[PDB]
Design a protein around this ligand. Structure first.
Ligand SMILES: Nc1nc2c(ncn2[C@@H]2O[C@H](COP(=O)(O)OP(=O)(O)OP(=O)(O)O)[C@@H](O)[C@H]2O)c(=O)[nH]1
Ligand SMILES: Nc1nc2c(ncn2[C@@H]2O[C@H](COP(=O)(O)OP(=O)(O)OP(=O)(O)O)[C@@H](O)[C@H]2O)c(=O)[nH]1
Ligand SMILES: Nc1nc2c(ncn2[C@@H]2O[C@H](COP(=O)(O)OP(=O)(O)O)[C@@H](O)[C@H]2O)c(=O)[nH]1
Ligand SMILES: Nc1nc2c(ncn2[C@@H]2O[C@H](COP(=O)(O)OP(=O)(O)O)[C@@H](O)[C@H]2O)c(=O)[nH]1
Ligand SMILES: [Mg+2]
Ligand SMILES: [Mg+2]
Lengths: 428, 426, 428, 426
């Protein structure tokens, strides 16, 4: 019943920092590993120290060093903290090939070591970003190997969705297009969120006009914990990760369920207001709490999964579902009946001490696969096209051995993906 | 992971004098060589620029090169000239005299072998080089002349390392050497294809900034080279220190170069205003972005809104929100969409470091690659042609064996860069 | 059994301030929402805090800020407090169109959120003023949307009637004429009062020669509470808001019942004097207590509703009615028999601590639809005409996209309305 | 929500010197720049006129413009000249000399580009502008000449913002420049159609008030400009602070302008009487209304009962009953019905603010738009014609290129405003 977390790149690792901090908060784990009390994620020592079963990869020493100098440096095993010396430079060509390919063997052997520590490997999940060099480059490299060795294990990916308006990486389209090509075909499911959309959540629901990544990742951590800690904890409907895959992936392509999370409420907003299960789920179908800037009303739904924490009575859930099925404007694709996975954990929602979110007594996470995602690809299509037509920055990949045909090909694969969304949109 | 820096020419040597000063400031390293800081980070990534010698002495990984001992001596005589080891002072005797031919082609060429040997010794001292940086003037004899020669050999030895250089570009008003455009022309001919990237610094623009926004009436070159070092140091510290974004020089180079030949940069810097107004300034991300976008805060005598922007890098130092940065950069892109090139979606890229420059809460470095740069080339090329026809001072150069057809090709090559900027100006 | 209050504009909000203060006084609600004890208006939290189901709209931050800095800032949910940055400038053209139309979507979504919080939305009522920019401009904009979404819910409006003698808004006729045009057709019933008439009440019955709006709105609040708090509380004849509409609106045009309220008595005037139900109702048919400067004797009655608080025995009421039907000079329109709605609540009348009105043991509110209202329109007709003939101030509307024909049209709609009153006056 | 103010000409600069002083008084802001008040409201809406710079420094959102450093210097030398940032002092060198042509047409025109650039910088610094205000003299070179030029460009950039100005109108007795009516004529020609509204201040009337009701025998321009600032500050504070009525400048503009071209105002102010009588005064709403209606308390040398009143605004500061205000305004309308225009029912409009001016319990600002205003235009037009025929000083103006037919059209336009006042005088 075990799983492995993999943190690649800054985004992967810094999100991971929040994630493991939250898992410590879930059980009262001390920075040194001492836990007085979740062995699905952790491995126990004779001292009662538990080791989070995870791998941290950075090709630049700095971020891992940040871990190594922080409080959780005692928690993590030195072998889990893997670092190279040089970067990918925002570039798949080095991340996947030239540079990252050198260290990956080590990385894999640490993974395999942990796989041998697992007794019942259920699977794993990889945290990264769609635009970066290691964030997406190295990441896909890893998938190429992991899908061989662990072909039957859960291969869930979580990635930051490139913001349409702000991006620090000029060749991000190129990176992301190459990842599509290689991840679609290897991964089982990839989830993503938009930091821009999140900012809007922070300013509207948390009332914060100063979000940093350390805020943004707390919110992400919430979502992740709902599906990682609480799915291993007790509930009414205990849903596994493999079950998630078995209930969220409808086609052999990928699919890309997007996150939505409600409650996201400031402490003051929690006052004077009573949420019910149904009210929280109402919020879950509002564009306003959509974690990716993509309009839910534009597309049609294919999948939807609702996962519940704390004070949730199935009775209320059932009523809530009835209304979301019938009251809303949620259009859905023919193919699908509304079999929405309901996970119901008794495990209460948790809050980070010193965080922004209010203590809540119940909480709902929503995953959804909508046809509007093709518009996200359309965004990438043109951004890629523009660059590629001019061949701007192309020498930074070509010099590492990339082929122009390959890039065209990858775009075409994306186009095919868009076409399959088109297909799904056609009802039948 | 490490960088080697080589300074050359009177300009380059004096700029480096400020550069290294700042780097040691950043890390708390005393003018005599030992570390007396007070932050973990200060020593943590020191390796990129210093070798720790026995006794907790730090040796700046750089070579000081000239052909006149006196300049070298003056450098050595000040604080931080003592931190450099004697072995990093490589110099000859008898000038160059601001003559490319002497520097590159003949006499200075002789010295380069000893320089390179020391370079090799340092390349071995490093664990893993990220790259090299050189400081010099485009119209100078050793600055460009000898310096260029060195670059061609270093690149040859290390194709896989970053080769960049910062150079003083002849300002429209103050040329010193009559053939300064000639030397510059020759350096383009050699440098552009033998470098990964070059930065364009105009002293005239710098003198305007120092009075325009800084309202100063006494600067010297040390004060202006302080500003230069602010941009240079800004770039590498992030690479050195923990941040949020993507802090690798090579990745910067990748994001800023859309085409093999067009790698010229316009540095700018924020915040950068007089003390009077400091009581009336607010420190926000939009505040920095206002200063960064404004052409008057550019250190290059160009005008980015005249040309088109190919690439923009915004590097931030200090604690800022990601949201705010993202939004303001987007806004910039939006509002100045008429200057950006349509081929590159979201042409403004960012990098974020969480360490502020000593004494400030926040700061930002503007790096741009516009088409406007071509205007500098045009000015030089034109001036060159006139001189070319007359052979002004070319007897000095041809006397040392420089052939006019080589110069002819150099002229073409200048014109080629302009035409390629036009090819992507659209 | 729930309802929504909507406060638009200063007038709407400042009146609302008095209204919600009174509701707090009705139940002992603390500024923080803590109530130790009316859930038709309030929504309960787990802390026992109740939230008044209302929306506050101001396009200028200041008045809402006044709320936000007062004691009731703890009572109101931050989302209920909606503010823009700029004003309508006394001008429908900006209030309804150019400016207010930008924010209204937010406003509506907060309303809809509350509508979803309602379980049995009975309806709502809107507080505003006939002359202002947001007071009437924005207001009608809102009605345009609310009448779609909540077409079957109560749409009661309350508005300040422009004083014939004092008005601070030079284009008030123009504003009010435009509202007629758009409110008549959308709203169900609009009530109004005249601050000038009220001043006369304050100086004659309360003996106060220094009324401010904070006095004036207390009196308004009294009237409103009689029909809002006490209609949800227990009585003999418990009358609902929908019942009010069903008992006050005779035609599909609008109608405009005017308020009259008796008792309005200073503490000293209460001494030495014993009011009965009948005596209070006698006062209700006196011009002297008419809250709008319009002569009750001029027109004919069409509707009349009497609502009773405290110590009222139907027995006495019946006798009182007999005398008002037969003793008075109240002429009434043929169409109507005297079926005057009698609401009889046991709920006692309440008084604001530190207010001007005397503690009373019983109280009567009167609503009435008289044909004399056409004279009010006549006032507007000429005021509008004068301005419009000269085209004074016209550029302040035209520049926002208003049409001159439209203005003529709106006047004509008013003329038609006057003609319908003429019609009703003709007995048949 | 915010306002930008620009001062120009010696007049405008000295008026603004008092204006800003008062605004800072209103908010408890020290002459050096920091906030040392004591009321929540004092900071709460400060944004309309101040930028808070780092350190809790407030920067007045205004530009000081002149063509002689010495006037600017004298402004800067006093308290509150230190609160302005150096960047708000935009000036040239060599006067204008009270010459429209220089100011507008030629030389001053050159400076305007730098002024406007700063304007743009401030427009960006604001979140949302409500409008702009300018202070100047109608018969002055930079006051009107250069100032007008600026206005035409600002309006162009921001059609959707309020453009108003307060200006010193040549008093019948004291003209300084021989062609002061010429400059004024030209400013009408340009301003009227390039502004939303303009206020008419007569120094002669002001000197009468200061002795007539205030019984003072020593005023200077600073004392009279205090009175000016009282009216200016009166208007904007309400917009800033909580009140009862309708506190928006644009709404004021809407209520006061019945016709696109007739937007001239007569400011007045109450209470405004000597200390002796202050022991014999009662403070009631009728008391303020008596002072407001009385023509002698007008700051414009007009006579509203000679003309007809188109619009009246009564702004009140401090706690007053609504009833009392309503009734007294009605009474005014009733008793002075012979002066009001019959086309506008209830021509007297009100605005109410609950914050009194510092030191007073209550106050009121009178703003009127009568037909009487045309008399000022008539005086100028006539004087103009005489000069026009002789070309007095027009060689200075034509020497700088100003054409006489442009002046001819200006004359017509003056006459047009008069005829339109007649058209609505009836
Ligand atoms: N939510 C979130 N997004 C982040 C975080 N850090 C970076 N990102 C986003 O991820 C992308 C940045 O990737 P980089 O940091 O440049 O690169 P990397 O993927 O770590 O790998 P390299 O390019 O080789 O350094 C941008 O789109 C950022 O907005 C973080 O902590 N949280
Ligand atoms: N009874 C009562 N009447 C009020 C109050 N405030 C204002 N009024 C009246 O309502 C009208 C004023 O509307 P304004 O305050 O100018 O404007 P608004 O309707 O709030 O909206 P804007 O014009 O955009 O500011 C006048 O006729 C006032 O006499 C109040 O608190 N109580
Ligand atoms: N910014 C800057 N420019 C310099 C300095 N010294 C010389 N220059 C510039 O360099 C050019 C002259 O070349 P120089 O450095 O004397 O050549 P070299 O010494 O023979 O290699 C002129 O354009 C100068 O403005 C300096 O310390 N700082
Ligand atoms: N109220 C007032 N009027 C002034 C002041 N200064 C000059 N004036 C008037 O302005 C006119 C002269 O224009 P001036 O301001 O010198 O023009 P400029 O300086 O060339 O733009 C005369 O009618 C003066 O009465 C002042 O400080 N206050
Ligand atoms: Mg990284
Ligand atoms: Mg208002």
């Amino acid at each position: 019943r075990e799983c492995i977390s993999i943190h690649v790149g800054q985004a992967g690792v810094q999100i991971g920092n929040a994630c493991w901090e939250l898992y410590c908060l879930e059980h009262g784990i001390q920075p040194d590993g001492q836990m007085p009390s979740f062995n699905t994620f952790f491995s126990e020592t004779g001292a009662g120290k538990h080791v989070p079963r995870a791998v941290f990869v950075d090709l630049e020493p700095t971020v891992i060093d940040e871990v190594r100098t922080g409080t959780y440096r005692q928690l993590f095993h030195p072998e889990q903290l893997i670092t190279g010396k040089e970067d990918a430079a925002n570039n798949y060509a080095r991340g996947h090939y030239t540079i990252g390919k050198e260290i990956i063997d080590l990385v894999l052997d640490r993974i395999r070591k942990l796989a041998d520590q697992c007794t019942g490997l259920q699977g794993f999940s990889v945290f990264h970003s769609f635009g970066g060099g290691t964030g997406s480059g190295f990441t896909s490299l890893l998938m190429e190997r992991l899908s061989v060795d662990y072909g039957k294990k859960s291969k869930l990916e979580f990635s930051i969705y490139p913001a349409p308006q702000v991006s620090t990486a000029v060749v991000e389209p190129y990176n992301s297009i190459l990842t599509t090509h290689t991840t679609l075909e290897h991964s089982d499911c990839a989830f993503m969120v938009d930091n821009e959309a999140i900012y809007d959540i922070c300013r509207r629901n948390l009332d914060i006009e100063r979000p940093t990544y350390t805020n943004l990742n707390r919110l992400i951590g919430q979502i992740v914990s709902s599906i990682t800690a609480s799915l291993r904890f007790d509930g009414a409907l205990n849903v596994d990760l493999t079950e998630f895959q078995t209930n969220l992936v409808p086609y052999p392509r990928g699919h890309f369920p997007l996150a939505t999370y409600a409650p996201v409420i400031s402490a003051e907003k929690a006052y004077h207001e009573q949420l019910s299960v149904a009210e929280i789920t109402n919020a879950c179908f509002e564009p306003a709490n959509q974690m990716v800037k993509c309009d839910p009303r534009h597309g049609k739904y294919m999948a939807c999964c609702l996962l519940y924490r704390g004070d949730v009575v199935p009775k209320d859930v059932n009523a809530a579902i009835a209304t979301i099925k019938t009251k809303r404007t949620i259009q859905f694709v023919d193919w699908c009946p509304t079999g929405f996975k309901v996970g119901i954990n008794y495990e209460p929602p948790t809050v980070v001490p010193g965080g922004d979110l209010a203590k809540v007594q119940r909480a709902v996470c929503m995953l959804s696969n909508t046809t509007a995602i093709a518009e996200a690809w359309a965004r990438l299509d043109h951004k890629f096209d523009l660059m590629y037509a001019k061949r701007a920055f192309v020498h930074w990949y070509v010099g590492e051995g990339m082929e122009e045909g390959e890039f065209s090909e990858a775009r075409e694969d994306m186009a095919a993906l868009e076409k399959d969304y088109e297909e799904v949109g056609v009802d039948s | 992971r490490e960088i080697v820096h080589i300074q050359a020419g009177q300009c380059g040597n004096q700029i480096g004098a400020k550069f290294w000063e700042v780097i040691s400031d950043e890390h708390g390293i005393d003018p005599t060589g030992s570390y007396h800081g007070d932050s973990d980070l200060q020593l943590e990534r020191i390796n990129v620029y210093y070798n720790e010698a026995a006794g907790n002495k730090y040796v700046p990984r750089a070579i000081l090169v000239d052909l006149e001992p006196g300049t070298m001596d003056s450098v050595r005589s000040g604080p931080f000239g003592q931190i450099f080891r004697p072995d990093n002072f490589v110099f000859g005797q008898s000038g160059a005299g601001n003559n490319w031919a002497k520097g590159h082609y003949t006499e200075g060429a002789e010295l380069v072998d000893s320089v390179l040997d020391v370079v090799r010794k340092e390349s071995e001292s490093c664990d893993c080089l990220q790259g090299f940086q050189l400081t010099h003037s485009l119209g100078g004899g050793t600055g460009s002349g000898m310096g260029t020669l060195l670059i061609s050999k270093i690149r040859e030895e290390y194709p896989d390392r970053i080769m960049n250089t910062f150079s003083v570009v002849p300002s429209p008003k103050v040329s010193d050497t009559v053939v300064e455009p000639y030397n510059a022309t020759l350096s383009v001919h050699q440098l552009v294809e033998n470098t990964d990237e070059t930065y364009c610094i105009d002293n005239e623009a710098l003198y305007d900034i120092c009075f325009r926004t800084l309202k100063l009436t006494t600067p010297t070159y040390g004060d202006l080279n302080h500003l230069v070092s602010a941009t240079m140091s800004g770039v590498t510290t992030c690479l050195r220190f923990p941040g949020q974004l993507n802090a690798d020089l090579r990745k910067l180079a990748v994001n800023m170069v859309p085409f093999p030949r067009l790698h010229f940069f316009m540095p700018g810097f924020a915040p950068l205003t007089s003390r009077g107004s400091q009581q009336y300034r607010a420190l926000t991300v939009p505040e920095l972005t206002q200063q960064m976008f404004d052409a008057k805060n550019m250190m290059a005598a160009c005008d980015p809104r005249h040309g088109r922007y190919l690439t923009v890098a915004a590097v931030f130092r200090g604690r800022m929100s990601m949201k705010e940065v993202d939004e303001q950069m987007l806004n910039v892109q939006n509002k100045n969409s008429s200057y950006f090139v349509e081929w590159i979606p979201n042409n403004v890229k960012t990098a974020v470091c969480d360490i502020p420059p000593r004494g400030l809460k926040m700061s930002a470095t503007f790096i741009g690659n516009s088409t406007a740069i071509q205007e500098l080339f045009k000015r030089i090329s034109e001036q060159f042609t006139a001189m070319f026809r007359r052979k002004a001072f070319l007897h000095w150069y041809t006397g040392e064996g420089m052939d006019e057809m080589e110069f002819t090709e150099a002229e073409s090559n200048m014109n080629d860069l302009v035409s390629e900027y036009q090819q992507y100006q659209d």
